[PDB]
Design a protein around this nucleic acid. Sequence first.
RNA 1: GUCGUCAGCUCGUGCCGUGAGGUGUUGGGUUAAGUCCCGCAACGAGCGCAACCCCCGCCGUUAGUUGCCAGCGGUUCGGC
Length: 122
Amino acid sequence: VKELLEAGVHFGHERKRWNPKFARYIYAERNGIHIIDLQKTMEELERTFRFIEDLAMRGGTILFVGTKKQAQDIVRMEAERAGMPYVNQRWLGGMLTNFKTISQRVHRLEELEALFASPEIE
RNA sequence: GUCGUCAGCUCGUGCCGUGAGGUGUUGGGUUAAGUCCCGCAACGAGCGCAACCCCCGCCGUUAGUUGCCAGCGGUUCGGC
Ligand SMILES: [Mg+2]
Ligand SMILES: [Mg+2]
Ligand SMILES: [Mg+2]
Ligand SMILES: [Mg+2]
Ligand SMILES: [Mg+2]
Ligand SMILES: [Mg+2]
Ligand SMILES: [Mg+2]
Ligand SMILES: [Mg+2]
Ligand SMILES: [Mg+2]
Ligand SMILES: [Mg+2]
Ligand SMILES: [Mg+2]
Ligand SMILES: [Mg+2]
Ligand SMILES: [Mg+2]
């Protein structure tokens, strides 16, 4: 399943913009485009998903991030539909690094959520 | 007093740099303005700018020893 699916319309990409390090994953270069190794991808998702899995069964919170347009909503949906945090909008200096301060804003959205639904606009 | 009512000066954390330091405050648009929008490795905050105070312009409320025949009556015909 996870095999032929990806093997389908989901393989290879780009051309002449690449770290030679990522090259250990490329199978070939047909049509001038890098043909990523299909199999090598599956082999990886194995170790990955094992961590994805273990990480969830711990109850641990994953932060999703995809500011790129071709995935903006594709994050939104899947993260909400998982109770997990995500950011498809523009990222921010200190999201994690300067947490407490960025968080001050979250709290500010709580404060604003008060008056956004309270009889105090008399 | 003054530069100068100029729109500026700077702080917290993060990030950047061996460091002095940088970012933010820059950049596009906007305004009397670091005014505001937009963007952004910064996110936000403080002293400034504005706004809250006084005068002048229109109008209503309350007050009728100023003004008023607007309105009638008397007039030494002066709102006496
Ligand atoms: Mg949880
Ligand atoms: Mg209400
Ligand atoms: Mg109220
Ligand atoms: Mg100066
Ligand atoms: Mg400066
Ligand atoms: Mg500076
Ligand atoms: Mg420019
Ligand atoms: Mg300001
Ligand atoms: Mg009047
Ligand atoms: Mg008369
Ligand atoms: Mg008469
Ligand atoms: Mg008459
Ligand atoms: Mg009288």
